[PDB]
């Protein structure tokens, strides 16, 4: 029945404008207010504003007046289909987040408890084009003791956009693996790590290789990790 499909993830450079369209279905379009909420990864949720899909009026929080415009298009033919677009000018570091689209519970047009959401539209603001990662080994240092078990891994550095895949020994090695959430650097480029817990004896005797695949850049790479002496 009810469904809200949003734009695919977008990547914009600072100062640019982004538009996120949300297509509503399965209900009378002009009978409910659509709201917009941003989810910033580290922080929490942020209300952007709301649009009256019938008259087209716009109500935004002060933080965004003059920087953002909501527009709706009602469908020629049917009342159970409509699209609401969002446009935010001069995007900056603080604006990277997942932008969600949602409509109120029936009877709550004057309030804002959102019952139906779109899948979410990530928009990253970086000063960068598509790039392949550089993969460096991580191994315990020359005079490093690790009582009991030891660790190693791959640093997957300076790539854009997300995402990447990281396996080990082409899959044969899976116990003890930890591949961590990517972090966006001040460079506008992503950096990620994938490590694995392994016995101290085995270090230096078994072959460990990380298998990286950055599909956006067509980059596929295998790197052997080895401790040095």
């Amino acid at each position: 029945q009810v469904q809200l499909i949003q734009s695919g993830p977008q990547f914009k450079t600072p100062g640019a404008s982004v538009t996120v369209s949300c297509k509503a279905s399965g209900y009378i379009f002009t009978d409910y207010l659509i709201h917009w909420v941003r989810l910033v990864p580290g922080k929490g949720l942020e209300w952007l504003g709301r649009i009256n899909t019938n008259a087209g009026l716009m109500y935004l929080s002060h933080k965004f007046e003059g920087r953002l415009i909501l527009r709706r298009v009602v469908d020629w033919r049917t009342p159970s289909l409509g699209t609401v677009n969002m446009e935010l000018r001069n995007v900056r570091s603080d604006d990277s987040a997942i932008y969600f689209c949602g409509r109120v519970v029936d009877g709550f047009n004057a309030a804002g408890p959102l019952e139906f959401w779109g899948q979410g539209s990530p928009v990253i603001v970086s000063s960068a084009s598509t790039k392949g990662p550089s993969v460096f080994p991580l191994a315990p240092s020359s005079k490093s003791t690790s009582g009991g078990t030891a660790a190693l891994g791959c640093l997957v550095k300076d790539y854009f956009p997300e995402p990447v895949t990281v396996s080990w020994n082409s899959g044969a090695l899976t116990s003890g693996v930890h591949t961590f959430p990517a972090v966006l650097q001040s460079s506008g480029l992503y950096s990620l790590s994938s490590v694995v817990t392994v016995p101290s004896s085995s270090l230096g005797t078994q072959t460990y290789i990380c298998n990286v695949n950055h599909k956006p850049s067509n980059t596929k790479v295998d790197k052997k990790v080895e401790p040095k002496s």
Partner: protein, 214 residues
Amino acid sequence: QVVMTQSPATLSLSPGETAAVSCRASQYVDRSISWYQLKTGRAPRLLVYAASSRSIGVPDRFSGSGSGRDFTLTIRGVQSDDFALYYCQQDYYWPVTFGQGTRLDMKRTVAAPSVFIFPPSDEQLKSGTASVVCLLNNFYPREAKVQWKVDNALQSGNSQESVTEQDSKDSTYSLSSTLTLSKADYEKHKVYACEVTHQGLSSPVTKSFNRGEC
């Protein structure tokens, strides 16, 4: 703006126990309070609206109380599917505002982390950057702190870290921290250390290497 304060920030429980998130409001708000469940890579799910109305599709174990400035979300029979973040939302005044969010964990014995430090590799120092990486492996509770010291000088602003989902078999976490520097400044100092603080550790743990010591 209307500030909304949630408590606790974290909440560890095992399946079956009852949980109670409370959301305080900076001012009166009739009953214009909502609750949302939030999971990684998924849209927010409405649990309660108008402070007490359970939304359709939501199990009867979810329930919302409160009125005025003190509201509560209760989960009687907690279940695995209920481990996630929960946020409160006010719409009495524009603009809408949310709480900081509560993390609903899965309790287990305290477990201190295994700490490893990794120096910058051959290949990366020929490219022009130094990345020191510090790993905190398979630990619990989730709250953990990492400080970086070079020549024992406390580093600030030049570090980034990442935390993994709560593992579904040990119920532990792991943390990766990356200290990025210039190759020029990396070759300036000798000792690189990663101090780690956690509830399961008697005292601070420090893993280090000496730049260039064989």
